[PDB]
């Protein structure tokens, strides 16, 4: 096997030109699509805002049309999913991870229009879901679509173009090239066996979708938080403590998200009409809360800059947290199309901010700025629930651009993964694949 | 299928003892890296102090510059040729082998050989990095604690070997991410599944970085300040720069490999012809580290200067050619020390050059050569050693210019794509292949 290694080493990093070229066309499409989806969601949130202006008087009539708009659009989304593609409910990342393990089908002719138009409805209604879910899955299917449409043969081409699709999916979702590529090679890939994923092609895919994203979304960052202060060495231990707190909370949240899937499954019992209507009830509650306390609803991207700057009070933070936990669950655990990735950044910031405030007054000799703890806490729920720290840390870094906080960010994150391990919690994306993969064997 | 459900529910569960031991590994790797760093500094300093004591008599100084660097070079080649030939050159090839179980990790030998050997070659002002020394020493450190605590199992053997190499690169460039990313893009067994625990690699890198910051706070290794932005209609220029790195990446590999061979004849495997030839090269370094310091040394000094566009076109072209020469002679002669660093240096100097031509050609783009300098910095690492994701993240971590991320990726990927289609090979695999093939031949 040594002579085999000398044979292999001399032949490393040689991807077939056709796989590379097709990775490029995958990215391009994934990007344009993500960009389109992004704009669709925006347009709808905007129309909905335009209705509340047409009924800006009559207070109850406003609260009504806020509900009904988000109700109808949510219902429309749940339906498009329940009716034509049940695999494209919830996130979509569980499924694409399965698809890489050959354990799941990539029914693109179905999912693409279902996730797209479905997400358009759930997200555009102002529900507490991300864009990653939609774009990552849509991304994978797009990579599947071009695999089929061009009839590319082999394991390499099937895993790679499925992976790069997912990568360009996350990348065009957060303007985060690195986080995309890192996500694949830390989470997306078959975690227990060797695979035929070409990293170089994943890149080209991510590149293309980022370029497509920058073409249409130049000169406005997703999160602008400005350059925060530094973190002195004798401060570091406070980030460990913060991580520990995220560590014990990470799995606790996974119980809630899993259990709430079950608790909400009874309200409809797998019935299309009970579901669609239940969905429109949650959806409407979001467009309602996106008026009476917008911090509780929506994707979450709005409250991040505000929280980091320390413009929220301790009360308001605690309230934002509690109510977001609620609305994050109700939206995701009810299997509506949309990622959990984003509202998890929101919850992490809000917690980090809170811990930072307490830190600030307790240690005035440290000259703390809560916002550093807000940025350390940002990717921490990602490292404690999803258990992908290297993705979460690089995701944060790419969006907040505070590299001087690299150490506190790593330390918090690693503390969250180490304590999410020792409190018996599971990678929330595996856990749902295992529930889905087990529930398919458990009907035989 | 049912095996997968069993595995998924059991993912990311590293034995606490592997975690705990990864933490100690880092700590040691770091303190050692820090120590080595300081040693090299101390010696570069003493050698500066000698040139002061003979600051008059011109040929007398040129001589004492040679002799200091000669002697300390010879001392290094000897400590390697005599007690651990595996710790010559980089050391990264060996540790990669070590993870493939195709090479032994003789820490009782290499630790003090690489350490004090590097101290000699580096401290003499030779064109070698600190990565080589620290990465290898790092792995061996992880081996040492594996042995000394008798930790059993593949996981423990590969993990503590990897995190050692990771905490090795990490405290080498103050670059935590580049460390972890290097393991999972290059260092790992590239063709089969392995038992490396990422979570534990982290803890290791963390600890070595904390060790590095405790002794090296408040001074960055490269300070280039915040450069300008890169407009979208500029991007194609970084593709072209990448392509140019792509064609040169393999050509450089030929010369590094071929120059190992051409230098092997001057000694023929003979300890005395070797150690004296080594002192001849070493002495040429301390000499050039006086008559044109930009041609000699680790290279870290010319980067900030190059990026700001303080070098002329002539001076750049000369620093390039002369550095190609001195980089080869020092690494290809199997002296202990990484090639990682002088590869960044080469990349910056080329990038800057490309940027200057760019600036005058397209005044409507409002270019700043220094953006192309930072795009070119990790590019040689993506074309010679074919680890772009590590090279990009390494540069980003050292330069802090995240707004140049696209140019950086585009150049890098252009370098990897064109180093593939001009038949070049990952220079760290190519050396492992040479060493592993020369073992059965």
């Amino acid at each position: 096997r040594r002579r085999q290694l000398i044979r292999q080493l001399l032949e490393r990093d040689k991807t077939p030109l056709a796989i590379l070229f097709m990775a490029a066309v995958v990215g391009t499409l994934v990007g344009l699509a993500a960009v389109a989806f992004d704009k669709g969601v925006a347009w709808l949130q905007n129309q909905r805002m335009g209705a509340l202006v047409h009924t800006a008087d009559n207070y109850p009539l406003l609260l009504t049309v806020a509900f009904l708009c988000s109700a109808v659009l949510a219902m429309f989304g749940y339906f498009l999913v329940r009716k034509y593609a049940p695999e494209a409910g919830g996130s979509g990342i569980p499924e694409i991870e399965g698809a890489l393990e050959d354990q799941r089908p990539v029914r693109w002719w179905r999912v693409l229009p279902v996730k797209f138009f479905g997400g358009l409805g759930t997200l555009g209604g102002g529900m507490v879901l991300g864009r990653e879910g939609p774009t990552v899955q849509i991304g994978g299917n797009i990579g599947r679509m071009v695999l089929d449409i061009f009839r590319l043969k082999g394991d390499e081409a099937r895993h790679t173009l499925l992976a790069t699709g997912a990568a360009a999916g996350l990348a065009a979702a957060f303007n985060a090239p690195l986080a995309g590529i890192l996500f694949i090679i830390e989470e997306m890939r078959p975690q227990f066996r060797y695979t035929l994923i070409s990293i170089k092609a994943v890149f080209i895919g991510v590149i293309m979708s980022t370029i497509m994203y920058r073409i249409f979304n130049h000169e406005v960052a997703l999160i602008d938080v400005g350059k925060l202060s530094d973190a002195p060495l004798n401060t570091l231990w406070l980030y460990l403590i913060l991580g520990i707190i995220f560590g014990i909370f990470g799995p606790i949240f996974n119980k809630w998200v899993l259990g709430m899937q079950d608790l909400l499954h009874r309200v409809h019992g797998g019935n299309i009409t009970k579901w669609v209507l239940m969905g429109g009830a949650i959806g409407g509650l979001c467009g309602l809360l996106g008026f009476v306390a917008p911090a509780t609803s929506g994707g979450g991207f709005n409250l991040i800059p505000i929280a980091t700057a320390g413009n929220f009070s301790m009360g308001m933070l605690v309230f934002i947290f509690v109510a977001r936990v609620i609305t994050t669950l109700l939206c995701f655990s009810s299997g509506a199309p949309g990622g959990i990735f984003a509202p998890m950044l929101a919850l992490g910031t809000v917690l980090g901010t809170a811990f930072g405030m307490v830190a600030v007054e307790l240690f005035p000799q440290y000259h703390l700025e809560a916002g550093t703890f807000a940025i350390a806490g940002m990717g921490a729920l990602l490292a404690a629930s999803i258990r992908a720290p290297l993705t979460g840390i690089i995701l944060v870094l790419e969006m907040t651009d505070n590299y001087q906080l690299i150490l506190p960010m790593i330390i918090t994150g690693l503390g969250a993964t180490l304590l999410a391990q020792f409190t018996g919690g599971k990678p929330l994306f595996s856990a749902i694949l295992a529930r889905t993969l087990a529930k398919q064997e458990a009907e035989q | 299928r049912r095996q997968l459900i069993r595995q998924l529910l059991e993912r990311d569960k590293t034995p606490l003892a592997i975690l705990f031991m990864a933490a100690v590994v880092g700590t040691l790797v770091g303190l050692a890296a820090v120590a080595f760093d300081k040693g090299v500094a101390w010696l570069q300093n003493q050698r500066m102090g000698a040139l002061v004591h003979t600051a008059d008599n011109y040929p007398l100084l040129l001589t004492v510059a040679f002799l200091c660097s000669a002697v300390l070079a010879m001392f290094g080649y000897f400590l390697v040729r005599k007690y651990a030939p595996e710790a010559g050159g980089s050391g990264i090839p060996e540790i990669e082998g070590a993870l493939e179980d195709q090479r032994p990790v003789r820490w009782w030998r290499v630790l003090p050989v690489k350490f004090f050997g590097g101290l000699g070659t580096l401290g003499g002002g030779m064109v070698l990095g600190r990565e080589g020394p620290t990465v290898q020493i790092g792995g061996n450190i992880g081996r040492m604690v594996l042995d000394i605590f008798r930790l059993k199992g593949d996981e423990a053997r590969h993990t503590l070997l990897a995190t050692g190499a990771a905490a090795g690169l990490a405290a080498a460039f103050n670059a935590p991410l580049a460390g972890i990313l290097f393991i999972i893009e290059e260092m790992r067994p590239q063709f089969r599944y392995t038992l490396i625990s990422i979570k534990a690699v982290f803890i290791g890198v963390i600890m070595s970085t904390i060790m590095y910051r405790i002794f090296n706070h408040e001074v960055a290794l490269i300070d280039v300040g915040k450069l300008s932005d890169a407009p979208l209609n500029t991007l194609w220029l970084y593709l072209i720069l990448g392509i140019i790195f792509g064609i040169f990446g393999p050509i450089f590999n030929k010369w590094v490999l071929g120059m190992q061979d051409l230098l092997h004849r001057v000694h023929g495997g003979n300890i005395t012809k070797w150690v004296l030839m080594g002192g001849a090269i070493g002495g040429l370094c301390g000499l050039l580290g006086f008559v044109a310091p930009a041609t000699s040394g680790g290279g870290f000094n010319l980067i900030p200067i190059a990026t700001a566009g303080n070098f002329s076109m002539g001076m750049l072209v000369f620093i390039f050619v002369a550095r190609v020469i001195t980089t080869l002679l020092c690494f290809s002669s199997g002296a202990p020390g990484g090639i990682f660093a002088p590869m960044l240096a080469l990349g910056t100097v080329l990038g800057t050059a490309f940027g200057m031509v760019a600036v005058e050609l397209f005044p409507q783009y409002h270019l700043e050569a220094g953006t192309f300098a930072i795009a070119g910095m990790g590019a040689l690492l993506a074309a010679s050693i074919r680890a772009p994701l590590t090279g990009i993240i390494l540069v980003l971590e050292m330069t802090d210019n995240y707004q140049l991320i696209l140019p950086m990726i585009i150049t890098g990927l252009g370098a990897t794509l064109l180093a593939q289609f001009t038949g070049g090979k990952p220079l760290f695999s190519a050396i492992l292949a040479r060493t592993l093939a020369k073992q059965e031949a």
Partner: antibody
Amino acid sequence: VRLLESGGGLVQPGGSLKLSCAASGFDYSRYWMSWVRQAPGKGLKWIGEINPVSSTINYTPSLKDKFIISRDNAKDTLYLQISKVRSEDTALYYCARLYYGYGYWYFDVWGAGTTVTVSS
Amino acid sequence: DIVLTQSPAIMSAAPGDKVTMTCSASSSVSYIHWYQQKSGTSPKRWIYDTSKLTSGVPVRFSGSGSGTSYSLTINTMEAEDAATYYCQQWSSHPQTFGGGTKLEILR
């Protein structure tokens, strides 16, 4: 964001004057500045431009030291020295902050302009 | 340097009219710009990269074209639109402005 250029007024033909532009509301580094002028009742003409670290400074088809564009970043201020002043330099001088969309640059926020009259 | 010459030197139209002025160039220019200079005021970056509107420009304004010919259209003109408009390129150094189309209102 305000560009408030001053220093204009009366000059005697052949002499020289230093215009200043004082900026406030944006990081005065990071931006390329420019000078555009407007002779009375006529269109717009590009005088020159200057990057942040004063390392590149292009002028328009002028002469030797006809125009000279400096900038004291420590004062958030842009300067323009016009020497050997003939009466084509009787104009309104806008200091303007420069920026790009896709990449082909434009003149972003414009100042009020100062008036320069060249007469005896 | 590129010479841009602008269609009507001066034009008159009653509000509610659809109005297009033209910017023609000596060579090939791409992603040009437009400035609005209302009377006794400094110009305002009005349209940029051939088609994008600056932030706070009514959606009644549009812009298009490529190569030699460019336009700016006010679809249903308003009387508050009375200015002189300048086109400017910097696709080729040095940047060069247009001659100015001057919109007059017929009331």
